[PDB]
Design a protein around this ligand. Structure first.
Ligand SMILES: [Mg+2]
Ligand SMILES: [Mg+2]
Ligand SMILES: [Mg+2]
Ligand SMILES: [Mg+2]
Ligand SMILES: [Mg+2]
Ligand SMILES: [Mg+2]
Ligand SMILES: [Mg+2]
Ligand SMILES: [Mg+2]
Lengths: 287, 87, 105, 129, 250, 97
């Protein structure tokens, strides 16, 4: 390149030639000299020059603005409100097209996080991912995706394209484990059993219309037919699909990972899985 | 000159002496042993059986679950009675 | 035993095209030999090493990539180079009688 | 008490990848999401706009002071000035006057006043970058 | 038998690999024993001397811990009582003999405790700085590739004479793949020299590359650097620190 | 008269001693070593500010938190007083509020 040719022409680059990019290093202003000295920009007497002006929000003794406004429960229980990261069908299709999410295998929160399609923060009260109808019109991938919340239109698009969608609950601990399994495996603890949804969320995940993971499977075909009739598409018979087994694969309600069972210990150092055999431990981990 | 050998992580598990007073307490509990097992495999030298709860710990966990996490049937019954009362 | 330091000065030979085409025939022949692409590392190395050994002047690593064709090699080997010190250059630049230059180095 | 087994496939499935996978080959382009691979062979132009690590056109909206809207074509290699000339020719009919631009030759970037991310992305796709 | 090296990592279709002479230290005149193709994205990147400066200043500063401290008027010994009353003495008002005004008093705004200047540039920025340093050396003809660092003898005189004959700089930074496998001959030769410094591949850094006039690399070190620096390109955003297991990261 | 009447003894600096020659080596230990070691682990110094930076108040708080129990009596008293004064200054004084 011309720049490299100019380098060849120019002297050697050393530690005596380095210079910061102009504009990156603002000059430091210090109170010496006529312009920046004398009162040093602090004003004249009063509190401001003495550096003792009242706290922020103080209005000189008048009832402050942030205190004369009545208290209202805008943020009550904010730290207890569940949050679900949105996953638009546009984003899902983008990920599938770029190969960061493989639709030939069951898609869940672990796969989404691994493909970097979503960023979950369980410490920030995130409870998982919610499917979003955005991009439904242009969504064409056939996928078996498991999420936490799902809109009616998103479910309709997934099912119209021949895929399967199920809403699965994850309590914060299981959510963190599934989002970041490798750190959990390095913790050395046995895989815990996923906890059931709280009483308030139980109806959502036991309702077939939401494709809840605890809902009666016998009611799923009626709900799928209702959505197909509502949105004017023919319900594809997935049982005849070559990927029917993959589409049908769903993890057990008390299971975090598809193959691994609660109570197992993943020894990553030597590529092994220790399975407890004590009857009491097995009963507890199957409970 | 020749550079000093590159710094490297102390290979294998590190087991501080419990007798030493200066060893931090978090390096002596079972959590440290579990972490060492996870990181270094069988080379940790810790019995894998210790990873799972001891029977008393299992009893405590089961009691806590019974106390705080109700079963699906109990949740459904509570929801049903609440809905009936509201109606 | 370390050989004596080589002078960096290099005056292109008069029979440069003939020598280069002889080396091209030795390495690789077809018409318009100046356009023979040096994309093969083996042939590029052979030609450049032969030229460096013969002429005492080698292509620097910086220009090695841009020496893409025999024409580029010919251009590089016909552009001259001199290694005389700055004192020698100034003294041989036809200094006027009223200009005296000396180094204390 | 303990029982070790080799079912580590279900853990290898969970292991994430550190390297961005190459996009799969599609029979038809553009893909449903709109993505399209760079044209092969590369277009014969004085400049080249290398795709981002995500395989997307490096055209980004930017805003400063809450009112200054700009669009940056960032990963440019070659004649950034030729790219500037082409961008000006392409955008003058749209904007109505020659757009104001900064050619950061050192960073190999072109900054244009105003939001033109979509138009520039489509134009670069047509050019084949 | 020429030592021809090709680029293992994929090269962009619009870029052609840069080239370098593979040399050998076994003889004074062995200035061309092969030809190496160097990845353009590592050895032909943009000359961003601004990034060079950023990385050099980072390397100089982040380790810095200034141990300068001064006693404030509260820490200076004594100075509890009032030197004299406010009024009637005819002297200036004072509250302690250890205020900054007094001789032997405290320091108003002096260095305070061991201060750290630690800050981390993005690893992408640091890798790009390494790449730019390599490109600068190659473009300015200070980079020399070698098949191996094996020397005919461990005498430092041989190494110095060879560098002088080949017109290398007054300072040479030789790099080998790993510390353990570095040849005994070169180890002995460079242990007794001050301007010829031998480092492992993992120890390469912008500050030392700039300090040393010429940079000598081996073919394995070239491959190592190419892989390590190119990975930063096309790596995802981390899910967790790369020290933890990944599907494809060693 | 605050100026010396003789040149100070010449200050010779060996630019190629071991320290300067090998300065900066292993600064890229992470990126060039599979990230086994973070570059901050190459920092040798006080335990409470290894790979960490902050203003004077933060540094004093960290020192008290991490080595406060091992500090000498008067040094710890001075640190407590300094933390108190720095808190008051930073939270109650300044041009901006
Ligand atoms: Mg003024
Ligand atoms: Mg005044
Ligand atoms: Mg006033
Ligand atoms: Mg009042
Ligand atoms: Mg911005
Ligand atoms: Mg006192
Ligand atoms: Mg007083
Ligand atoms: Mg004193």
């Amino acid at each position: 390149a011309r720049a490299l040719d100019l380098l060849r022409g120019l002297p050697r680059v050393s530690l005596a030639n380095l210079k910061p990019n102009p504009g990156s290093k603002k000059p430091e202003r210090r109170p010496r000299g006529r312009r920046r000295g004398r009162k040093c920009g602090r004003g004249h007497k009063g509190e401001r020059q003495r550096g003792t002006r009242p706290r922020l929000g103080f209005e000189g003794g008048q009832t402050p603005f942030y205190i004369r406004i009545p208290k209202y429960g805008f943020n009550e229980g904010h730290s207890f409100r569940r949050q679900y990261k949105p996953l638009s069908l546009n984003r899902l299709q983008y990920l599938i097209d770029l190969g960061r999410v493989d639709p030939s295998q069951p898609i869940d929160l672990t796969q989404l996080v691994n493909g970097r399609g979503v960023t979950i923060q369980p410490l920030k009260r995130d409870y998982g991912v919610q499917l979003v109808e955005e991009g439904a019109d242009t969504f064409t991938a056939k996928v078996n995706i498991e999420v936490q919340l799902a809109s009616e239109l998103a479910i309709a698009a997934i099912e119209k394209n021949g895929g399967v969608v199920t809403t699965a609950f994850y309590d914060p601990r299981s959510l963190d484990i599934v989002c970041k399994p490798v750190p959990f495996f390095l913790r050395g603890q046995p895989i815990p059993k996923r906890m059931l949804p709280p009483e308030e969320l139980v109806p959502y995940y036991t309702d077939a219309k939401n494709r809840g993971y605890l809902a009666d499977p016998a009611k799923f075909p009626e709900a799928r037919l209702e959505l197909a009739r509502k949105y004017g598409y023919i319900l594809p018979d997935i049982t005849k699909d070559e990927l029917f087994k993959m589409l049908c694969t769903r993890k057990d309600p008390r299971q975090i990972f598809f193959g691994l069972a609660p109570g197992w210990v993943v020894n990553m150092a030597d590529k092994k899985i220790l399975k407890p055999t004590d009857e009491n431990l097995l009963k507890y981990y199957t409970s | 000159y020749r550079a000093r050998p590159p710094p490297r992580r102390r290979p294998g598990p590190r087991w501080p002496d419990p007798e030493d007073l200066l060893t931090p307490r978090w390096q002596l509990g079972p959590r440290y042993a579990a972490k060492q097992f996870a990181r270094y495999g069988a080379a940790s030298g810790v019995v894998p059986g210790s990873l799972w709860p001891s029977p008393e710990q299992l009893r405590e966990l089961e009691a806590e679950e019974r106390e705080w996490y109700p079963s699906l049937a109990t949740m459904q019954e509570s929801l049903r009675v609440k809905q009936l009362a509201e109606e | 035993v370390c050989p004596p330091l080589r002078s960096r000065a290099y005056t292109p030979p008069e029979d440069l095209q003939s020598r280069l085409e002889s080396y091209v025939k030795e390495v690789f022949l077809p018409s318009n030999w100046q356009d023979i692409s040096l994309e093969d590392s083996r042939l590029k190395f052979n030609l450049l090493a032969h030229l460096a050994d013969d002429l005492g002047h080698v292509v620097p690593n910086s220009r090695l990539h841009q020496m893409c064709r025999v024409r580029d090699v010919l251009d590089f080997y016909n552009v001259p180079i001199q290694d005389r010190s700055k004192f020698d250059e100034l003294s041989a630049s036809n200094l006027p009688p009223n200009l005296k230059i000396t180094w204390s180095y | 008490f303990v029982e070790s087994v080799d079912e580590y496939q279900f853990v290898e499935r969970l292991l994430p990848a550190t390297r961005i996978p190459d996009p799969p080959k599609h029979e038809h382009y553009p893909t449903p999401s709109g993505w399209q691979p760079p044209r092969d062979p590369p277009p014969n132009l004085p400049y080249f706009v290398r795709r981002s690590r995500m395989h997307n056109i490096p055209v980004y909206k930017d805003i400063t002071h809450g009112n200054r809207q700009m669009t940056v074509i960032r990963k440019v290699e070659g004649d950034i000035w030729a790219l500037q000339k082409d961008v000006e020719d392409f955008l003058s009919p749209l904007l109505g006057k020659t757009p104001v631009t900064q050619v950061n030759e050192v960073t190999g970037t072109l900054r244009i006043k105003g939001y033109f991310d979509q138009e520039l992305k489509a134009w670069l796709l047509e050019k084949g970058f | 038998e020429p030592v021809l090296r090709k680029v293992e990592l994929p090269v962009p279709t619009h870029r052609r690999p840069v080239q370098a002479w593979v040399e050998s230290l076994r003889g004074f005149e062995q200035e061309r024993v092969g030809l190496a193709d160097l990845h353009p994205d590592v050895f032909a990147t943009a000359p961003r001397l601004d990034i060079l400066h950023q990385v050099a200043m980072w390397q100089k500063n982040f380790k810095r811990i200034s141990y300068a401290k001064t006693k404030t008027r509260a820490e200076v010994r004594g100075g509890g009582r009032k030197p004299w009353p406010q009024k009637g003495t005819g002297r200036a008002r004072h509250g302690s003999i250890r205020s900054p005004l007094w001789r032997g008093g405290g320091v108003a705004h002096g260095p305070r405790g061991p201060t750290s200047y630690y800050y981390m540039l993005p690893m992408k920025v640091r890798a790009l700085g390494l790449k730019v340093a390599l490109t600068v050396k190659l473009a300015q003809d200070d980079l020399h590739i070698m098949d191996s660092l094996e020397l005919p003898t461990g005498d430092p005189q041989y190494l110095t004479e060879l560098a002088h004959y080949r017109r290398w700089g007054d300072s040479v930074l030789l790099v080998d793949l790993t510390h353990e496998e570095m040849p005994q001959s070169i180890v002995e030769a460079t242990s007794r020299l001050k301007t010829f410094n031998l480092i492992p591949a993992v120890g390469l850094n912008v500050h030392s590359m700039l300090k040393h006039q010429t940079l000598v690399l081996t073919l394995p070190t070239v491959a190592f650097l190419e892989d390590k620096l190119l990975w930063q390109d096309s790596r995802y955003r981390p899910l967790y620190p790369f020290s933890l297991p990944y599907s494809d990261f060693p | 008269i605050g100026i010396r009447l003789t040149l100070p003894p010449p200050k010779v600096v060996d630019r190629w001693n071991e320290k300067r020659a090998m300065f900066g080596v292993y600064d890229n230990i992470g990126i060039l070593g599979n990230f086994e070691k973070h570059p901050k682990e190459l920092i040798r110094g006080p335990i409470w500010l290894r790979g960490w930076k902050g203003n004077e108040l933060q540094r004093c708080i960290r020192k008290r938190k991490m080595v406060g129990s091992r500090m000498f009596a008067d040094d710890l008293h001075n640190l407590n007083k300094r933390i108190r004064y720095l808190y008051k200054h930073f939270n109650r004084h300044g041009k901006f509020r």
